[PDB]
Design a protein around this nucleic acid. Structure first.
Ligand SMILES: [Zn+2]
Length: 266
DNA sequence: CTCTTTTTTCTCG
DNA sequence: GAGAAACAAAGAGC
């Protein structure tokens, strides 16, 4: 999940579990609770879910008066709302049981994480992670973005993936954004001119907001439509919609990287 | 059979 | 920065 997929999950959870009292919590893989499973079970059992927020790719359950459960889905994490009698599935790891159903977390690769912290610890938690601004016109200041790009020799794709210039891009939307902005993923950032940086800035906001509107690319969130709008990601060998050149795939800083060699000049 | 492929954060040099 | 670890599964190829 990237930011649009996490936001989609957030919205669905907000609609359905806000106001629910947690009756019990069970784990078959307690080790994914980085702050300690038995501790979380003791603290949250009997508390009511008050809200669900998001920061970058992180989900934040607001529970009780002053608890915040920070959940990261990493590569394959999936939530679903199931009946209390639902059968166990192979990669289900945790469940919060309510009176009329349960929220189950599954993750084939076991990468996803849960951390229980307090309300006043949330802002420091994200400062420590060095997460950059949300991708909105209000929060994503082009001027600082420009200054950071000017002073780095990092390649644009991996720098964007750091979450530090702006929060929320993963492999799919970084590839999509760079195609939209006509920038090659290996471009050193200090080579980008002002007009390119402006187009990149706006393209990041536009692509992510579009993906949110379309419910993400493809349990909660599994109804997305953004996948039908992808121009390069996973489109190796197909033709660029703009110029007709074949989309190419290369490896950049360890990641599969899809681009048009005409539209995105090296 | 081996090798490659698919978010974050570490070690290494 | 480069490479790989955390982990599981699927596909290609010998
Ligand atoms: Zn093109």
């Amino acid at each position: 999940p990237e930011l649009p997929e996490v936001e989609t999950v957030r919205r669905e959870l907000e609609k359905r579990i806000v106001g629910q009292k947690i009756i019990s919590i069970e784990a078959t893989y307690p080790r994914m609770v980085l702050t300690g499973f038995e501790q979380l079970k003791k603290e949250l059992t009997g508390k009511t879910i008050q809200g669900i927020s998001r920061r970058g790719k992180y989900l934040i359950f607001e529970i009780g008066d002053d608890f915040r459960l920070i959940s990261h889905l990493r590569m394959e994490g999936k939530y679903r709302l199931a009946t209390l009698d639902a059968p166990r599935e192979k990669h289900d790891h945790l469940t919060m049981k309510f009176a009329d159903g349960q929220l189950i977390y599954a993750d084939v690769r076991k990468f996803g994480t849960w951390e229980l912290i307090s309300t006043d610890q949330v802002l420091p938690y994200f400062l420590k992670k060095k997460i950059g601004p949300e991708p909105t016109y209000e929060d994503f200041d082009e001027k600082l973005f420009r200054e950071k790009l000017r002073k780095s020799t990092k390649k644009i794709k991996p720098y964007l993936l750091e979450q530090t210039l702006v929060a929320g891009l993963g492999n799919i939307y970084v590839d999509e954004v760079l195609w939209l902005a006509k920038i090659h993923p290996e471009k050193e950032t200090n080579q980008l001119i002002e007009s390119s940086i402006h187009l990149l800035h706006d393209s990041i906001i536009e692509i992510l907001q579009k993906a949110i509107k379309l419910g993400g690319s493809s349990a909660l969130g599994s109804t997305g439509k953004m996948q039908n709008e992808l121009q390069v990601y996973g489109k190796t060998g197909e033709k660029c919609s703009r110029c007709g050149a074949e989309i190419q795939k290369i490896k950049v800083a360890g990641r599969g990287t899809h681009f048009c060699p005409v539209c995105q000049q090296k």
